[PDB]
Design a protein around this ligand. Structure first.
Ligand code: TAD
Length: 223
């Protein structure tokens, strides 16, 4: 089983106060990430082509640029697992974090896309999660969920050995438009959202309620 807690070791940068500085420095940071992360570079190049195709269909929040769009498209792609792991295990050995720019752009994409609306979402997993009683919960990593319980419980994401999270999120963003899917009705939740009410029901249902945005352990680390 995996532990569900406040994600004390996750890279949870919210970039409070350094957005202008990051928008200037992240392009350089991105080249650095790529130079040491071949898988990310490939996922990004492929996502940039798809973004090019998606972009004309609609308008995006002011300040939302191609980096934000390409990061989000890439995330719904195959790179999510490796990225999330790197974020989750950050504090462990923060010398080899090669998603410095990627983490910023994806974080900023969701910040720009989130109006504040709250959602009832569901997330299915094939690995059992155990709440270790910390008092509250943060996912740490960016966390995918769906507006549809059907989707969350589908064999694609869930099995009896895993967990179904029933979540009320107010920072999650409906990113259907961006996904290589998009019938997954995905709501992407930032890892720094805190759920003040945690309730386990049965062996595989975890209810996460009372979301709140709280300060992160890291802030503008690479700015
Ligand atoms: N899960 C859903 O219901 C759902 C709805 S849309 C969606 C899509 O699924 C794809 C992958 O997303 P996902 O977030 O499941 C990938 P996520 O990084 O959760 O991968 C899950 C695996 O990573 C490891 N892991 C995850 N969390 C932890 C943890 N807290 N501690 C230790 N190890 C952990 C384990 O191997 C776990 O099985 C994306 O394309 C996303 O768009 N998933």
């Amino acid at each position: 089983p995996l532990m569900l807690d406040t994600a004390p070791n996750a890279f949870d940068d919210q970039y409070e106060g350094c957005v202008n500085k990051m928008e200037e420095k992240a392009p350089l940071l991105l080249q650095e990430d790529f130079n040491m992360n071949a898988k990310l570079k490939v996922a990004w190049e492929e996502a940039k082509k798809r973004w090019n195709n998606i972009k004309p269909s609609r308008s995006y929040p002011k300040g939302f640029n191609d980096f934000h769009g390409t990061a989000l498209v890439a995330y719904t792609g195959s790179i999510a697992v490796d990225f999330n792991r790197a974020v989750r295990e950050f504090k462990e050995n923060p010398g080899q974090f090669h998603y410095k720019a990627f983490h910023y752009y994806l974080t900023r994409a969701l910040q720009l896309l989130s109006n504040g609306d709250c959602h009832s979402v569901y997330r299915g997993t094939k690995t059992r999660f155990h709440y270790t009683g910390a008092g509250s919960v943060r996912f740490g990593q960016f966390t995918s969920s769906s507006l549809s319980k059907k989707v969350a419980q589908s064999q694609e994401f869930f099995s009896d050995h895993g967990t179904l999270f029933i979540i009320k999120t107010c920072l999650g963003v409906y990113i259907k438009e961006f996904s290589f899917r998009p019938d997954q009705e995905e709501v992407l939740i930032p890892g720094y959202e805190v759920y003040q009410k945690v309730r386990t029901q049965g062996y595989n249902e975890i209810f996460l309620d009372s979301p709140k945005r709280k300060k992160s352990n890291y802030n503008c680390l690479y700015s």
